[PDB]
Amino acid sequence: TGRPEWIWLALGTALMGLGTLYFLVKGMGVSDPDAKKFYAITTLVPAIAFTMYLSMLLGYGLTMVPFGGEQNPIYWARYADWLFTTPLLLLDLALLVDADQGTILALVGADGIMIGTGLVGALTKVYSYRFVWWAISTAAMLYILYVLFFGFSMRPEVASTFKVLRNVTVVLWSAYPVVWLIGSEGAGIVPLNIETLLFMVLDVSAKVGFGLILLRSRAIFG
Amino acid sequence: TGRPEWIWLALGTALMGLGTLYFLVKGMGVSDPDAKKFYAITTLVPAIAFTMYLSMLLGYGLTMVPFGGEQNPIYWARYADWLFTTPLLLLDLALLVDADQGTILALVGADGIMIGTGLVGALTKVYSYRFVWWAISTAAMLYILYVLFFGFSMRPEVASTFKVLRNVTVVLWSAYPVVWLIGSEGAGIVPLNIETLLFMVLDVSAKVGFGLILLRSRAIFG
Amino acid sequence: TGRPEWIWLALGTALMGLGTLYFLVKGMGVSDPDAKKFYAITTLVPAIAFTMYLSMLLGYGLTMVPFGGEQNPIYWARYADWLFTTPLLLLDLALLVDADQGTILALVGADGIMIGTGLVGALTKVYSYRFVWWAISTAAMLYILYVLFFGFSMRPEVASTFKVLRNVTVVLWSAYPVVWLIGSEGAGIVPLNIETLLFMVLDVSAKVGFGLILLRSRAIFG
Ligand SMILES: *C/C=C(C)/C=C/C=C(C)/C=C/C1=C(C)CCCC1(C)C
Ligand SMILES: *C/C=C(C)/C=C/C=C(C)/C=C/C1=C(C)CCCC1(C)C
Ligand SMILES: *C/C=C(C)/C=C/C=C(C)/C=C/C1=C(C)CCCC1(C)C
């Protein structure tokens, strides 16, 4: 179409779609109850992202938000995505280490707060206040990071995989607040097509890359 | 009112309302923890549908979607309904056979995808793309059907009831994609008042009929 | 700002924000898995309410609903709040007494119905029908009250705390339907600024007061 970012939304759609089919096939032969859990969570993450990448591609997941003078194009569908896929990615981490349910409920709820405040900030018409919501969301993000590092005798199959996925998680998740801030939702420093490319690379890596490291590990079997 | 389908929405409201009160009363005397589970899930399905049938009756759950030339009346409230009642109906099936949590998470998430893509398709303003969302939703539907047949030593109380409810589920659920397709959301082949009658018969049977077969069975007790 | 209720929204924001930080700190040193559960649920309730009080403060969580002649200001964000915090408050009660999952699913679903019908009623443009939704919502409220009293050998640490929190819950929750009814959502008897003060006192007490009684009790430890 007439949106230069179209290409990145198309590529994202395609990579999430093929990741989903790859993990669907791979989990084909699994009967270990624990492994099945990791396969369900992990296949669903890019299947959901596939649908929201498609909706942005076709224009459904775009709206116009007036602020600081202009009519700003905001991809809201990303927050419908993340609202479900980010807790699921935290659940993969949580089950891996056999987390207490109280830590799991802290993680999923802090994550909800993160995305939902992210979404408010994305849709807020008073420019200055958009960054008060960014800050609140970043604080929930940093609570989550804190818990993944200080919130938790695992078998070494689990600890090595956990540590890797944990490192991947903090490095990539921590880049989203930065892209938002300098992108079209925030200061408007980086154009939307570049932003959309940044978010596509993070999203494919955080979902499909993350899942490839997880699902190739023996950590997931009981 | 001035909507010919009003009658079917009124009848649906009434039948869901009486189903809810019937199951509420029936579960009155239950103390078996397992049976209580089946009674909670099963009573809630038509209580939620009661509220969304009422909202369509009163006009709240209707919006206008422009596409292929016209201003199309779309009952969106059906998707608020299904978003919660269809996973609950799958949970009744799942608990019955003592499903692994990984199979339960695959079912509920595939179901979310099904309804949420159904909803996108219902609200999409580009006529051709409405059927790309229909197709994606039908694929999640067929994954669910596949799992109910190939995804799963139960006591014979469970297997006989499970098989029946399973058969009821595939026959009725599989008719929704067809009604949508030829109805006002799709090709516009069947008028909205006839569509609304079709959806009312399916919905009462899939919820109240399904629950009557379930809740009259000894399969639900530990 | 130019809204007289601004002050109560500001005070509510501040009290929910300090409650959240207080409970965050207090739960700092907890390792008992059961206590951690109570701390997660209980800290999250005012953290979520903090964000929705802020959004009403800044104007995001306000919309205009035309009915009975006028353009009515409706704070919708309260229902985004309650949709999650009221089930969490019921979960604190439920875990305390070691409730059956079927009773927990009845509680959370009745609560969803309560808030979601509350929200429909708040946004309904036909004045008379707003009170049909109020009535349906009040009925779910009374089902919840019934279950907390008749739905359930606990150790006396639990029974004393449970009884207190239970009493707090019915007295304060039962006042919300009254405030709505005579406030701006309903008959328009009490002005919006007074209503907003009423809701702020109930909300701080039902969340922060409730949590102080809970989290100071030994009932929460295994
Ligand atoms: C699959 C997608 C992933 C892992 C996305 C993660 C997104 C975040 C961690 C987003 C965080 C944000 C904040 C901390 C600041 C406000 C804006 C957000 C939502 C982009
Ligand atoms: C109580 C209601 C039930 C059991 C409704 C079930 C609805 C479906 C199985 C709907 C499926 C659809 C698709 C597969 C295609 C797109 C449209 C839908 C949502 C009607
Ligand atoms: C933290 C907030 C709490 C505990 C809020 C509880 C709110 C209710 C119990 C609300 C009930 C309502 C009805 C029963 C009638 C319709 C309107 C409502 C949603 C205000």
CB contact set of A111 (below 8 Å; sequence gap of 6+) = A86, A87, A90, A140, A144
Ligand 2 centre to CA of B3 (Å) is 23
State the smallest CA–CA distance between residue A130 and chain B in angstroms. 27
Fill in the amino acid letter for A78: R
Residue A70, token pair as written in the block: 């202009």
Q: At what angle do helices A33-57 and A77-96 cross, to 10 degrees?
A: 160
Gap between the Cα atoms of B83 and A84, Å rounded: 14
Gap between the Cα atoms of A163 and A141, Å rounded: 18
Gap between the Cα atoms of A91 and A148, Å rounded: 11
What is each CA distance from B185 to A54, A57, B2, B113, in whole angstroms?
20, 21, 20, 18
Q: At what angle do helices B6-26 and B192-203 cross, to 10 degrees?
A: 10
CB of A62 within 8 A of CB of A74?
yes
Q: Which of C58, C90, C215 to mutate to test the interface with A (most CBs of A within 10 A)?
A: C58
Q: Which of C23, C30, C34, C37 to mutate to test the interface with A (most CBs of A within 10 A)?
A: C37
Phi first, then psi: what are they for B27, rounded to 5°? -90, 0
Burial class of residue C168, CB neighbours in 10 A (0-12, 13-18, 19+): middle
User: Which of C82, C85, C120, C148 to mutate to test ligand 3, by most ligand atoms within 8 A of the CB atom?
Assistant: C82
The radius of gyration of chain A from alpha carbons, rounded to an integer in Å, stands at: 18
Whose CA is closest to atom 10 on ligand 2? B176
CB contact set of B200 (below 8 Å; sequence gap of 6+) = B8, B9, B11, B12, B15
Residue A188, token pair as written in the block: 């408007």
How many CB atoms are located within 10 Å of the residue B136 CB? 21
Q: Which of A83, A90, A103, A105 to mutate to test the interface with C (most CBs of C within 10 A)?
A: A105
B188: left (phi over 0), alpha (psi -120 to 50) or beta: left
CB contact set of B23 (below 8 Å; sequence gap of 6+) = B39, B42, B43, B46, B211, B215
If DSSP codes are grouped into helix, strand and coil, which group holds residue B75?
Answer: strand
Q: Residue A36 and residue B102: Cβ atoms within 8 Å?
A: yes
If DSSP codes are grouped into helix, strand and coil, which group holds residue A96?
Answer: helix
Place of tokens 């419908």: A80
C102 close to B (CB below 8 A): yes
Fill in the amino acid letter for C131: F
Gap between the Cα atoms of C74 and C202, Å rounded: 18
How many CB atoms are located within 10 Å of the residue A158 CB? 18
Fill in the amino acid letter for A60: Y
What is each CA distance from C42 to B180, C86, C89, C214, in whole angstroms?
43, 11, 7, 9
**How many A×C Cβ pairs under 8 Å?**
48
C132 sits in which H/E element = helix C127-150
Strands (E), A58-183: 62-67, 70-75
If DSSP codes are grouped into helix, strand and coil, which group holds residue B67?
Answer: strand
CB of B107 within 8 A of CB of B147?
yes
Which ligand 3 atom is the nearest neighbour of the CA of C89? 4
How many CB atoms are located within 10 Å of the residue A52 CB? 29
Gap between the Cα atoms of C222 and C219, Å rounded: 8
Which ligand 1 atom is the nearest neighbour of the CA of A206? 4
Residue A7, token pair as written in the block: 């290409």
A100 sits in which H/E element = none
Q: Kindly list the structural domains of chain B, giving each domain's residue range(s) and its CATH number in brackets, ordered by start.
A: 1-222 (1.20.1070.10)
CB of B110 within 8 A of CB of B139?
no
First to last CA, chain C: 48
Q: Residue C109 and residue B40: Cβ atoms within 8 Å?
A: yes
DSSP-assigned letters across all residues of C52-74: HHHHHHTTTTEEEEEETTEEEEE
What is each CA distance from B53 to B47, B79, B80, in whole angstroms?
10, 11, 11
Fill in the amino acid letter for B195: E
Give the distance, in angstroms, between the CA of residue B5 and the centroid of all CA atoms in the same chain.
Answer: 19
CB of C77 within 8 A of CB of C52?
yes
Is the dihedral angle over the CA atoms B134, B137, B139, B144 positive or is it negative? negative
Q: At what angle do helices A33-57 and A6-26 cross, to 10 degrees?
A: 160
CB of A12 within 8 A of CB of B75?
no
Q: Which of B53, B70, B65 lies closest to B15 in space, CA to CA?
A: B53
Chain C CB contacts of B43 under 8 Å are 106
Give the count of alpha carbons within 13 A of B147, CB side only.
Answer: 26
CB of B202 within 8 A of CB of B11?
no
Q: Which of A214, A222, A221 lies closest to A45 in space, CA to CA?
A: A214
Gap between the Cα atoms of A6 and A28, Å rounded: 33
Place of tokens 């809970």: C214
CB of B206 within 8 A of CB of B89?
yes
Contacts 24+ apart (CB under 8 A), B1-10: B1/B59, B3/B193, B4/B193, B5/B192, B5/B193, B5/B195, B5/B196, B5/B197, B6/B57, B8/B193, B8/B196, B8/B197, B8/B200, B9/B53, B9/B56, B9/B57, B9/B196, B9/B200, B10/B57
The radius of gyration of chain B from alpha carbons, rounded to an integer in Å, stands at: 18
CB of A33 within 8 A of CB of A221?
no
CB of B151 within 8 A of CB of B103?
yes
C138 lines ligand 3 (CB under 6 A): yes
Q: Which of A17, A206, A76, A120 lies closest to A198 in space, CA to CA?
A: A206
Residue C120, token pair as written in the block: 């429909």
Residue A185, token pair as written in the block: 């939702």
CB contact set of A97 (below 8 Å; sequence gap of 6+) = A152, A154, A158, A162
Fill in the amino acid letter for A157: E
**How many B×C Cβ pairs under 8 Å?**
48
Burial class of residue B31, CB neighbours in 10 A (0-12, 13-18, 19+): exposed
DSSP-assigned letters across all residues of B136-189: HHHHHHHHHHHHHHH-----HHHHHHHHHHHHHHHHHHTHHHHHHHHSTTTT--
Fill in the amino acid letter for A137: S
Phi first, then psi: what are they for B190, rounded to 5°? -105, 130
Q: By what technique were these coordinates determined?
A: X-ray
| Closest residue in B to C124 (Cα–Cα) | B60
Gap between the Cα atoms of B58 and B80, Å rounded: 16
Burial pattern B198-221, b for ≥16 Cβ within 10 A else e, equals: bbbbbbbebbbbbbbebbebebbe
Give the residue ranges of DSSP H helices in chain B: 6-26, 33-57, 77-96, 101-123, 127-150, 156-173, 175-182, 192-203, 210-215
If DSSP codes are grouped into helix, strand and coil, which group holds residue A198?
Answer: helix
Resolution (A): 1.6
First to last CA, chain A: 48
Give the distance, in angstroms, between the CA of residue B9 and the centroid of all CA atoms in the same chain.
Answer: 15
Is the dihedral angle over the CA atoms C99, C103, C108, C110 positive or is it negative? negative
C22 sits in which H/E element = helix C6-26
Gap between the Cα atoms of A115 and C220, Å rounded: 30
Gap between the Cα atoms of A176 and A187, Å rounded: 14
Contacts 24+ apart (CB under 8 A), A209-213: A209/A168, A210/A89, A210/A92, A210/A165, A210/A168, A210/A169, A211/A19, A211/A23, A211/A42, A211/A43, A211/A45, A211/A46, A213/A161, A213/A164, A213/A165, A213/A168
Is the dihedral angle over the CA atoms C93, C99, C103, C104 positive or is it negative? positive
Gap between the Cα atoms of B23 and B30, Å rounded: 11
Place of tokens 């695992």: A154
First to last CA, chain B: 48
A141 lines ligand 1 (CB under 6 A): yes
